[PDB]
Design a protein around this ligand. Structure first.
Ligand SMILES: [Zn+2]
Length: 106
């Protein structure tokens, strides 16, 4: 009933509840960017159906040791979160914005 996450804007398949990743002890992290926008980020070890934009950047990174790339919905272009890489245990993961996903049956 609530096992997969889809893009809220279009329905694209994005991730699964089974793939939630407790980073630093919680899968949920609330953060702001330099423009003051607050994001409720859920960390996932894996995601699909995204389009990762550009090359990674360490600037303003919310997770120590990781560089990020913007992750858009590959279907509709909605900003769904970020892909993190260049770090350690794990090397990579996804930080997705909770309220931009819809949860539902597989
Ligand atoms: Zn979408």
């Amino acid at each position: 009933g609530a096992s997969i996450f889809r893009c809220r804007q279009c329905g694209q398949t994005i991730s699964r509840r089974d793939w939630l990743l407790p980073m630093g002890g919680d899968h949920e992290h609330v953060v702001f960017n330099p423009a003051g926008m607050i994001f409720r980020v859920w960390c996932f070890s894996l995601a699909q159906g995204l389009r990762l934009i550009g090359a990674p950047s360490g600037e303003f990174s919310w997770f120590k040791g990781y560089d990020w790339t913007i992750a858009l919905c590959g279907q509709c272009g909605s900003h769904l979160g970020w892909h993190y890489e260049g770090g350690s245990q794990p090397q990579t993961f996804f930080g997705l914005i909770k309220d931009r996903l819809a949860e539902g049956p597989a």
